[PDB]
Paper text:
The 14-3-3 family of eukaryotic proteins are abundant, medium sized proteins (~30 kDa subunit mass) endowed with a well-characterized phosphopeptide-binding ability. The human 14-3-3 family comprises 7 isoforms (β, σ, ζ, γ, τ, ε, η), that form all-helical W-shaped homo- and heterodimers. More specifically, 14-3-3 s bind protein partners that have phosphorylated serine and/or threonine residues presented in a specific molecular context. To aid structure determination, we have developed a streamlined approach based on chimeric 14-3-3 proteins fused to the sequences of interacting peptides.
Thus, the C terminus of 14-3-3σ was fused to the N terminus of the HSPB6 peptide comprising the key Ser16, which is phosphorylated both in vivo and in vitro by cyclic nucleotide-dependent protein kinases A (PKA) and G (PKG). The linker used for fusing the HSPB6 phosphopeptide to the C-terminal of 14-3-3σ∆C included: the ordered Thr residue at position 1 that is always present in electron density maps, even for C-terminally truncated 14-3-3 variants; the natural Leu residue preceding the 14-3-3 binding motif of HSPB6 (RRApS16APL); and a GSGS segment designed to provide maximal flexibility to create the prototypical 14-3-3/HSPB6 chimera CH1. Two crystal forms of the pCH1 chimera are remarkably distinct differing by the relative orientation and packing of 14-3-3 dimers in the crystal. In one crystal form (pCH1℧), the C-terminal lobes of each of the two subunits within a 14-3-3σ dimer are in contact with one C-terminal lobe in each of the two adjacent dimers. They form an interface along the length of the α-helix 9 of 14-3-3 stabilized by contacts between pairs of residues Tyr213/Tyr213′ and Gln221/Gln221′. In the structure, pairs of subunits belonging to two different 14-3-3 dimers are linked by a reciprocal interdimer phosphopeptide swap, in the course of which phosphopeptides, fused to the C-terminus of each subunit, cross-patch into the AG of the adjacent monomer. Lying just outside the primary 14-3-3 binding motif, RXXpSXP, this residue has no clear electron density suggesting its conformational variability. Notably, although being very short, the GSGS linker was long enough to allow phosphopeptide binding to the 14-3-3 monomer of an adjacent dimer. Consistent with available 14-3-3/peptide crystal structures, in the pCH1℧ structure reported here, the phosphate moiety of the peptide forms salt bridging interactions with the conserved 14-3-3σ residues Lys49, Arg56, and Arg129 and a hydrogen bond with Tyr130. The comparison showed that the two different approaches provided almost identical structural information, with the Cα r.m.s.d. of 0.23 Å for bound peptides. As expected, the chimeric protein CH1 co-produced in bacteria with PKA was specifically phosphorylated at the authentic Ser residue (Ser16 of HSPB6).
Numbering used by the authors:
A (entry chain A): -1 to 70, 78 to 243
B (entry chain E): -1 to 71, 77 to 243
C (entry chain B): -2 to 71, 76 to 243
D (entry chain F): -1 to 70, 76 to 242
The structure:
């Protein structure tokens, strides 16, 4: 390690505690640029930082795009465009770090799934706002990243692993919202849930909370997408 | 025919594998009547047997009551047959409640067994309440409430929030609040509390209860989404 | 032109609020103030909301970092100090921006009592935020600048506004916080807080339905602080009066 | 002496103004035993009289029980005197519960009066629970809970969420949950639900109605901060 890198990682941990996500992101970018492999803890810092930064831009873009769609003055279009351009710049930064530093085709496989999933996520966020001729390319870039990640996770991780579950949840969202394949989405989400449910006896104690949380999100999306809400209430199985 | 306790339990296990729930129920009733306590495995056999028997009667009653409710817009066969299924269902609930009161419920044995039976008492009074329309309805609802309340009091002092009997109990009592007692707010807030307290204590869970606890936590979340109208909400992506 | 620009900026600040984009909202509201016209009651609230949210996050961060830094001085590690200093400098820059707008545009050009009190209260607030982080020889000056702004605002609000007015209540609540946390006058704070609450409670019959929610919300914050500061929160639970 | 019903009600109003609660209680017990329903104003006089009488006994019992618990044999005077106060308190609760069961609950016509008395029955069983110790405590706790639950069921169907008897009932049943039944979570949930459902319909009230209800909503908020520990949080500044 570089010690600049060690100091930047320490400052990213301080920025997380302080809920200063743009600083956290800047510190984690700097750390990625000052070294090779990130540890599991350091990969999560990078992801949390940029998740929170784009999360707010995406939430804003949705509000503005919703106002623009209903009002159809030039201020809404212009401001929606400002937020959109800013969001695109963050996604380009994350995708640049992944391609130039983090994604290693001959590296550790588990870390390769995390980054390839992250590459699919940030191309998917670009696809959420893309309306040009470039849209098809963006959608395909996200699909390839997720497909490459899915292929590795199936060979290398158990079906209860939270990175593998997270990956399948996000790729099903991609199918539903982006690729307009709601049936593939429902299918993948049901398969992921059922394969993880069958392998619950081999769930390690540390993965328990993260895996069951993501399995709940899969079940929540399945209910939303199939219209399984309004069905009869459940009582205990025993 | 070997109808000694050990043989009735063995036949109850065969009946389960064969999906012969009325035989299972009869074998388990017979095993309870030897005047002895049930193990955790044996309590589950008793519950599975009667849950399957009463479940088919309830499902049938709902179909018939639904046909009877639409029909008035009427031959007497629907009312008569709905009444036949109701009476039969009431007899099973009375059998289960009789076994619980005369043999199984004690003050006291171990907390998990006490809670299990009191939860079972609230469940079978709740099934009687589902079909009750007379002056006796209030009494039935109160009998279900007391059983669940006594069970809730023991489970809070004696069991961890992730225990599946404690989770199952809270899930069923929240259903009782929503459907039977017409207290949808109490139901939502019990379901949310149960889920949140179990979610915080997930580190202290075993391989045995893993599947049972997370399955019941999923049912709590499913009911919360149905009852709060949270279905409509934005799709989830990974927290990662 | 500037008149169409001013209108666009205020409209974008309303969009930025809906989108929870407070730094943009602040920038749009600064730009609108720099058109040199007075702000309406609605526009004053947009300005205040924008900068309250911006500085709110910086202050919350500063408190976390200062708390981590204080626990390391009892084997760190200069990163906490350095990062706490970064957040503080950034916070100071926002307070200086707000205080500059108030002094150069808003306070000098305020017509009515409600707008004049609003801005003087805001001046007291942002000097109080500078006082929250100040440890130099400049500390005493900052505290006094805050006190004078609040005192001038209190003098106008007592002559010109009813005791239920939410700007007057907000002012009193913040000046009591200044007394408790900044000036180390917890008795003056409890006093002021109790007096403000009691005088507003007596004049509740003369409250409009518009200001009822804003006034009762601020009266709730006054009694919440009174409970915290007097330790009355530890008292026996209430049951029904009949 | 003028001991006709209306004069007993007039004398109870005078005893309230004079803070003579044992006389007030005796005047309202006397008016109840005339065999007519109590009006809304009259029900409040009955409740105020006995809440003040039992309140002083409860406050005393708490002081004495605290001295007896701390005295750690000692002198027997504390136990004996705590027992005297306890027996006296139990007698007042038995008097109120006897009036409710023999005259007021049976004869109540409307929902508001039915709820009022059932809430009052839960309260006085809760006061008996405060001084009971073992399996005696079980018995009493469940009489309190049933009275409260029956009252809650009627108030939800028959009264708006801003009604002060419905608010008072929820506040007391939440106290029962927290202190007596050891269910701090449903106490906190019931109090927040009650506050939030009442706050959503406050615009409908007059100034008198608004005052009565907002006082009980403040007590719900006060208990919520005590029970959730929200009072120890960072001080508020203006929004």
């Amino acid at each position: 390690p570089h010690m600049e890198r060690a100091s930047l990682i320490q400052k990213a941990k301080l920025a997380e505690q302080a809920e200063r996500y743009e600083d956290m992101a800047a510190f984690m970018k700097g750390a990625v640029e000052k070294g090779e492999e990130l540890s599991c803890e350091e990969r999560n810092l990078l992801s949390v930082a940029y998740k929170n930064v784009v999360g707010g831009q995406r939430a804003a873009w949705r509000v503005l795009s919703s106002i623009e769609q209903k009002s159809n003055g030039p201020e809404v279009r212009e401001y929606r465009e400002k937020v959109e351009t800013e969001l695109q710049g963050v996604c380009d930064t994350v995708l640049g770090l992944l391609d130039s530093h983090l994604i290693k085709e001959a590296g550790d496989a588990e870390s390769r799934v995390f980054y390839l999933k992250m590459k699919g996520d940030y191309y998917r966020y670009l696809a959420e706002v893309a309306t040009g001729d470039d849209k098809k390319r963006i959608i395909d870039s996200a699909r390839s990243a997720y497909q490459e990640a899915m292929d590795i996770s199936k060979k290398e991780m158990p079906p209860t692993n939270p990175i593998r579950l997270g990956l399948a949840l996000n790729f099903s969202v991609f199918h539903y919202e982006i690729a307009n394949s709601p049936e593939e989405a429902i299918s993948l989400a049901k398969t992921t849930f059922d394969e993880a449910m069958a392998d619950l006896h081999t769930l390690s104690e540390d993965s328990y909370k993260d895996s069951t949380l993501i399995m709940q999100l899969l079940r929540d999306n399945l209910t939303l997408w199939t219209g399984s809400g309004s069905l009869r209430r459940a009582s205990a199985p025993l």
